[PDB]
Amino acid sequence: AKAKTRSSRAGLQFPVGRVHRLLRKGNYAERVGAGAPVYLAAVLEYLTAEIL
DNA sequence: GCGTACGTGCGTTTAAGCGGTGCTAGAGCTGCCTACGACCAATGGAGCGGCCTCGGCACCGGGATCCCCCAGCCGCCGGCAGCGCAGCGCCTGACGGG
């Protein structure tokens, strides 16, 4: 078994891994969609790349 | 102090509102289908700490702006007093009239 981060798979730098945890444990819902954190990663990307 | 335009009020007139249909599309709904997301157990590399060295900025001193300021100055004009006189009423000629 060879591992690659979801961060690589979605062409993203913010940690779709870590952002996923803060949803599960951030008490925002009982269950978080598997495609939910990735979409949240990019929308931060465009909202961090834009200011800098 | 100016001044205009908006507050009040009269005379049209028109779209608001009611009350009346009649349609149907879209919401609420149940049943059932199924995949996908939680949970579990191992796993390793990515991320975070504790070092630790270069270099960007900091800090400075100096010289280069570059605005800020104000009489100088001329220019311009307005007021100003003086000037020359146009313009009108009555004075006053021209002269038969009074």
Give ∠ CA A51-A37-A45 in degrees, rounded to 5: 15
Find the length of chain A.
Answer: 52
Nucleotide nearest the Cα atom of A34 (by C1'): B37
Method: cryo-EM
Nucleotide nearest the Cα atom of A4 (by C1'): B45
**How far is Cα of residue A7 from the mean position of the Cα atoms in its chain?**
7
Contacts of A20 (CB under 8 A, 6+ apart): A6, A32, A36, A37
CB A37 within 8 A of CB A19: yes
Which of strand B's nucleotides are less than 7 A from any protein C-beta?
A: 36-38, 44-47
Expressed in Å, this structure's resolution amounts to 4.1
